[PDB]
Symmetry: C3
Subunit: 279 residues, 3 copies
């Protein structure tokens, strides 16, 4: 279904019947990071199956509640392009958030670390991105522009809101884990193969710090409709640049590193949310 | 949409040939804000895209839909006022049709303009950049306009893109700029295509600069590939309508309106430049 | 086209298994101009793609050839399926997954490529030791879509994709047979095609670390590694990429076919000699 104003309105009005929470903040949990949703108080869990026109080991959830005093909606489980979903499908949930009242989107993901100074388990705040699929004609906004949401040619300047980035740094710092925190450029590989050593070396040389297969499409849709964005990568593996190495990325090890840092990351987001300006 | 095969292209061309007697030798495509390169056409016939079967519609700002026939500096031209962009959702076949139609109408030379962001740090706002080469990012990544059964009536399966930007036309365009006092606005460089429609991020721009690109835009390469594929010679120029931002901490941003504005300020100079080039084209 | 799922792949494989009794351990795919690597196949059964349900056309059909080579049972794809032709992911994936159900353990592939690396000569062989998948990075990876669990994992790693023991063997064989000087190893980058690369594109690909550029192969290799088939791949340098926009020299497919024809017999001999020394 086209992520136009009519269909987005439908989905949003349905949800608005199943809950009274008007979210100001939207959160999306990446691979292995579903715990950032567990401190949500007065929560209402709505499975994607109960929502008409949302998409689909079992189902994902839309979770409404409060976190550090603020109203949030959490997407437990995202939609990936490598899974075969259309642009309209990936766009819809973000545009639905927009109509629910979301002003700030906070997204996490798991990524490989390209930058040679990164360690396993480090956090990399995104300050910029390289959208390889978008450069190559698979940008999520290809097609008729939905004018009710935003402009035909969006600019991506300050896409990773620099005030949110500064606040995220300051909160890490004050809570004793500033040393895990970096800022860098995320490049998206459509996937689903991990990157070869040749591909990793090339991505590093283009100026990329972390690589993953998600996140950019959601961020583009969010900036398109004027939602502010904060995004962080968990370094769940170190990319291998050397073809003679036996070390390889493995999705279980990604989930495992996720599980080890999920609580620290959950705590981080909650503390950030507590310090967000309230108007 | 309709396959850009010899049968369908013939239909469209024969229809147009009923609405006009002009046999074009030169085809012209106007980029964003550059519609005025068409206003000096004498003895003109304006045919809206709507009055042509199987042509598209165009819904972009700064692109009306007209096919304009007439003479320019003594030569017969057809002018696409308004082009078709991939970032709009159009198929390969839809973008390839108008250029293949030009081929059947008689076009030998194709002159294209477009608005672009300047990556090269020596470029100034309002500069002209003649394309001498391109980097077709969508084409490298399996979105080449020629993907699919080769239409043999038009060209070969594996076209070479050597001298795609005909070097004699580039030499002539430079000489004409020089003689008419605006040589200092003219550069030559490599155009890279971003599928779009997002403007490029600072990290994308930095990467594009480092790959050897001088200007970036979201058009043009597909049309050039179709034109070379069927043996049409090509001249192409970017207007620098903004300077790409390489620094993430900057507040400056690209804006469509400013692109249209810069286009408007230079459109007359560019029109004059094309007319002067066409006047010196060899004639048989 | 038909989903390359376990049900459909099983159908195609069971049909083939009625037309022949050969259980292949080794699969071979011939690139542009290289169809002769299939002519030494003894006790051969030629099955045209037309006589297989749900296989494609590469029209004028090619052939699936079963037989023995240097003592081993092989299946040969004479003629491959190219993304620039408009085939779906499922169509390119199916033949390789069929091989997997037929018993293939090792896949040997050849292709024609442009030489980017400035030390390459026309007619050189470049063994692939790694590959840049430009379409794959750009959301046209052959595995995009529901993962077919019966064949492989959701997120395959491509470490040792170009099996290093097969590469070492191939080198030793070239060496012992007097043509070690034609053999290099490098990185292959895929251009979706079908336009040859511009000089600015070539210069960029060279600078990214690429040794050869072609419009095929990587998708098949991804499907093969995904289902645990081991891979050996070689490019014939059939032209020298032009980096200079002022040059009049250009790639043309006839010259590609011509170089292929000149080297096809040496390459066929190379493959047969490699297969002879495969562990049994
Ligand atoms: N090294 C890596 N390269 C690309 N994606 C990764 C990497 N490590 C974790 N991921 C992410 O986690 C899943 C694959 O493990 C995907 O959703 C992907 O985005
Ligand atoms: N900085 C830029 N990057 C990519 N395309 C641009 C830029 N400036 C103008 N354009 C072109 O003009 C329109 C965007 O304003 C598109 O059609 C695109 O081709
Ligand atoms: N210089 C080259 N660049 C990209 N593909 C090539 C090149 N030379 C031969 N090929 C291959 O052979 C055909 C083009 O001649 C294609 O199938 C392609 O895979």
């Amino acid at each position: 279904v086209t992520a136009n104003i009519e269909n987005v309105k439908k989905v949003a009005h349905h949800i608005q019947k199943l809950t009274s929470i008007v979210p100001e903040i939207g959160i999306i949990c990446g691979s292995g990071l579903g715990k950032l949703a567990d401190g949500v108080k007065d929560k209402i869990t709505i499975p994607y199956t109960k929502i008409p026109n949302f998409p689909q080991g079992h189902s994902g959830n839309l979770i409404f509640g409060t976190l550090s005093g603020r109203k949030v909606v959490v997407m437990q489980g995202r939609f990936h392009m490598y899974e075969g979903y259309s642009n309209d499908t990936v766009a819809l949930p973000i545009r639905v958030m927009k109509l629910l009242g979301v002003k700030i989107l906070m997204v996490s993901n798991a990524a490989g670390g390209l930058n040679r100074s990164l360690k396993l388990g480090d956090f990399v705040i995104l300050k910029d991105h390289i959208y390889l699929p978008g450069l190559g004609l698979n940008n999520i906004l290809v097609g008729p522009n939905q004018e009710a949401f935003g402009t035909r040619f969006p600019a991506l300047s300050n896409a990773y809101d620099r005030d949110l980035r500064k606040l995220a740094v300051q909160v890490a710092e004050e809570n004793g884990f500033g040393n895990l925190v970096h800022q860098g450029v995320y490049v998206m590989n459509g996937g689903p193969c991990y990157e070869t050593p040749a591909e990793c070396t090339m991505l590093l040389n283009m100026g990329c710090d972390v690589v993953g297969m998600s996140t950019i499409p959601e961020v583009v849709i969010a900036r398109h409709c004027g939602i502010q964005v904060f995004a962080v990568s968990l370094v769940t593996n170190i990319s291998v640049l050397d073809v003679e190495s036996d070390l390889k990325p493995n999705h279980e090890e990604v989930l495992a590193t996720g599980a080890q840092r999920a609580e620290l990351m959950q705590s981080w987001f909650e503390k950030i949310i507590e310090k967000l300006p309230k108007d």
